[PDB]
Design a protein around this ligand. Sequence first.
Ligand SMILES: CCC[C@@H]1NC[C@@H](O)[C@H](O)[C@H]1C(=O)O
Ligand SMILES: CCC[C@@H]1NC[C@@H](O)[C@H](O)[C@H]1C(=O)O
Lengths: 587, 587
Amino acid sequence: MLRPVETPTREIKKLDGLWAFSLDRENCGIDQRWWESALQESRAIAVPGSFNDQFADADIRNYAGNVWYQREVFIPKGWAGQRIVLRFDAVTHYGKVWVNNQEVMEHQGGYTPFEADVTPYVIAGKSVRITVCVNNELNWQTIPPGMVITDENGKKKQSYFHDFFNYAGIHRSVMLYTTPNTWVDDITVVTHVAQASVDWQVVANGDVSVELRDADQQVVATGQGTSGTLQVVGEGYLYELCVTAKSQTECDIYPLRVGIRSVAVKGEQFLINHKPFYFTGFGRHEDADLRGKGFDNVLMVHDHALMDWIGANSYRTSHYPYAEEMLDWADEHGIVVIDETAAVGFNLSLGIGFENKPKELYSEEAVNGETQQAHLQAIKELIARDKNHPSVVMWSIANEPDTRPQGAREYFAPLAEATRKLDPTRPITCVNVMFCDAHTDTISDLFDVLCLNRYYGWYVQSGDLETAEKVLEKELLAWQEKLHQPIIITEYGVDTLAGLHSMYTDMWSEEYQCAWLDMYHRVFDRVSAVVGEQVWNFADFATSQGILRVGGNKKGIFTRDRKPKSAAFLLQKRWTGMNFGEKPQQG
Amino acid sequence: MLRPVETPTREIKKLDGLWAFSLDRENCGIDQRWWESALQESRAIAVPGSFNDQFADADIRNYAGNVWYQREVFIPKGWAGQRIVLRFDAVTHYGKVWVNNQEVMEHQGGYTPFEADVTPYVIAGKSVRITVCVNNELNWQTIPPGMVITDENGKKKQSYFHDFFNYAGIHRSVMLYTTPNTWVDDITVVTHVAQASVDWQVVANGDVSVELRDADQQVVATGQGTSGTLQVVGEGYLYELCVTAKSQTECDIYPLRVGIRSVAVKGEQFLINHKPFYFTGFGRHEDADLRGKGFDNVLMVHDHALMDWIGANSYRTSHYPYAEEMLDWADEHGIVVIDETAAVGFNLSLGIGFENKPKELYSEEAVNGETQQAHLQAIKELIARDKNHPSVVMWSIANEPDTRPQGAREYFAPLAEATRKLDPTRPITCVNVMFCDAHTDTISDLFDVLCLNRYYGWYVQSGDLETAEKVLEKELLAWQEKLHQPIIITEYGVDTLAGLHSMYTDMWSEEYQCAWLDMYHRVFDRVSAVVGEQVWNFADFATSQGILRVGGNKKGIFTRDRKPKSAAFLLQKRWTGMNFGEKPQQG
Ligand SMILES: CCC[C@@H]1NC[C@@H](O)[C@H](O)[C@H]1C(=O)O
Ligand SMILES: CCC[C@@H]1NC[C@@H](O)[C@H](O)[C@H]1C(=O)O
């Protein structure tokens, strides 16, 4: 499965915004089969957006259970001789959908599309009732995991183990799509460099021809057959190889953009086209002021303008798969992307407070075999749909897992190996949490380049930069000599509320963010193996409520409404001072 | 008159803090001679402090009229054979005081001490009732001027024409002081340099000897007689010449600290000891979070620590005489000080809004002959008590007067000339307001070095730095060629609320403060005659309420509680980058 693009392939975008929405507090929907009649006592909701914060209501915001969307649609008239298929680009956590009293789809996965042919349940020209049942619950076999808890009164409350807030709803595009009656499924392409080759595979209903055209889209070379190899002689050139499906009586044309993408890892260097690289940029989040994680074109354009100004050339889709629009953008603009799945919270050592969670991390009570297989499904879907993007430069299996407990490597080994089985073109990482240090972590052996999320001077060095530097440097050198891999610091940052200034350079002040980030920068400058720096969050984002979070995680370089803290000008001076992709040497 | 210093001269500081305080809303005090009995229905007040904000009450804060202080004191026992005299170091606007049913003092002037012998109304060992009547009203014969307005109901409301808020009360030290029965009044010293001479004058009751001792206080030379001359062979050396009064039967010793102070103005240079200088620093204010203008040692130590860190070597006592403690401090620490009197608001062209003020500035209705003589008294008192301070480097007659109307120079000429008559040792200035530009101002001819308060890019160039630079530079060159004087930019700054960040570098944001101040700095770098830069306010301060002021004037480099905005690090980088007293040349 890959993204619908239009040519003699058509669609009616159904991000019509306003659907009928209703909560299901007493779980009556399935039994009264609500999809059967117009929702009783509904309210208007926006459909590219989370349902949590759109109504300024704490009881919808913290709601756990089943919610219901509904929307009627007229199917276009020129589709009577076509297959009508219905695609949701992201339903966060779980979705099941009924096209007029007949059930059509079901899917467990919050950041990946799922589609299904409904041509035998539609006829072009008339109006059908679409009803969606969305679930936002997490158990130990979900990606990410969690524990629902039902109190004395029967009220559900969801507990989880990741920082960001558990936003849910229809966060991305809904889509009615038609394609000619022979070509259905997937295409895959792989690219090589010689210090200039390709490959093709199409799955459709008949003969296939493929022609690579360039940005002027004049044909630069053509083959036809499911496989073989053509050759050819800040932001990146994207050719376009146009694959055609000659068969039955109708032809089908699909355009797939390809970039000359190359890379594996070599010793201590993350090369690109046989070129050393330094990652600069951010751990991101899909989080905005009123839409939750809902995608929005304005926000995307503005935050790319911000990363462009600040000099970042890369980022990482922190803790879940992102809106594909962003990877198409990264394609055209030459942004380097670390693709991560929703597998966060595999750790019960991070929660901090005054408050019964399972005692053995890897076991049947928690992360079991079912968990490992749901995980492998998540990696499967992320690779299945982002495989042809040039901007995806590395896969990341999970984020900050607890690898101290027994059973950790028995769990993660088949996943690393299987993912290498899923695509050998790009490297494999697993971002490492602070407390599984160099002397302790179990799984770093299995990955190509190890990524570190370290916060010396914040969570563990009590605001004392002068010792934090020393600790961070030992640990740096230790990691490299233990694995002689490239080191990408994927998370590093401190909570700072915009407006707090202090002569004493204290924690939470803007001066402290500046000083802390630049001391980290000084040690980066001095160790061979660090090939990347991505600060911990570009903007402030929302989290669940707790004594550690003042209205959200304030570790951002920008505020939630995208206004710059002082450190935004620190980074801008450093990241645009170096030349592109090259690390500042030691002074 | 000069400050009491203790040796065989004694005192009991009466900043005992808590006095009895009462408002007099229906003007009953004088007629019921309240000083006669303990105040009826009083509340505790602090006496180094303004009465306005100490009670968190809007009706005391905006009160106009008469207020009453009271406090009983036991006179020390070892004073029975002495003159007991009572000194208030500052009663803001007007004060009259009764020592136990007998009236002893009266004074019109808010920032200068006034004292009086009350030895025949006291006897050592017993307790006396001190009652003070403090008035906070301004008319056109006050320094500064104003207009009280009585509405339909008989309620007074005070109108004035200066930015800062009209704080009042006992703002500085109260003091019981004793000195031996021969020496009463003044001493004056004058110092010269030869690319090393002095003079003396004592007024007392009998023969005088004087001996100059140095910081090790070993006598370095001695004379005796009211006059003559001795000679000798970042922060400044302060000798100490100890003047003694030999007479009657009792001797009296007064210690007066002297600094080798030198300077007049030469062409386009403000020399010091025949050395070109660049003023750096601030226009200040006496304004803090709960004391109003009340002096406080902690605040003084901290804000000197801030000016020291930031690299400022100078400041100007904006719009009234300061606490003498600060000029003693500036003495020991080598801070250069522009001494200004309370003569602000001689201008009716500055108020901006939607709201009957007199039509002719210089005339009998407003600033008349009585006004000119009250003014000359104010200059008289400021020079009379700050004449021997080395840190005072220049007198400033007034701040931002309206010189366009007819009669302006007829008013200001006898004042400039008279002040030059009051002390020829230090130069004379009159800070100039924006709208009396180089082609218009009437009085700049009469002063030694002209000081400019300019705000291009804020009040008159609508937030457009790129035109503001050009305007400011023409006007610069124009001023110099018109007078070939040194130019000290005494005010330049913009309102910026800490916390407002903006990618667009808009007005009120911290980025705009940084950009604006540094563009001003670029033009300063390029014009010969500017010999000084003092930004408009070090910290945010309170003003009266209006649509132009958000909780006060936000033009400060620091917030009112002394926290640094981003520009505090801009200035610190520039003012400590140059060497001391030398201007950065053009790049
Ligand atoms: C010490 C663990 C740090 C943690 N790392 C994972 C991110 O998802 C969180 O945002 C980050 C944080 O605490 O902000
Ligand atoms: C354009 C006149 C500016 C004015 N200059 C006098 C200062 O007393 C004020 O504080 C300052 C201001 O507006 O802030």
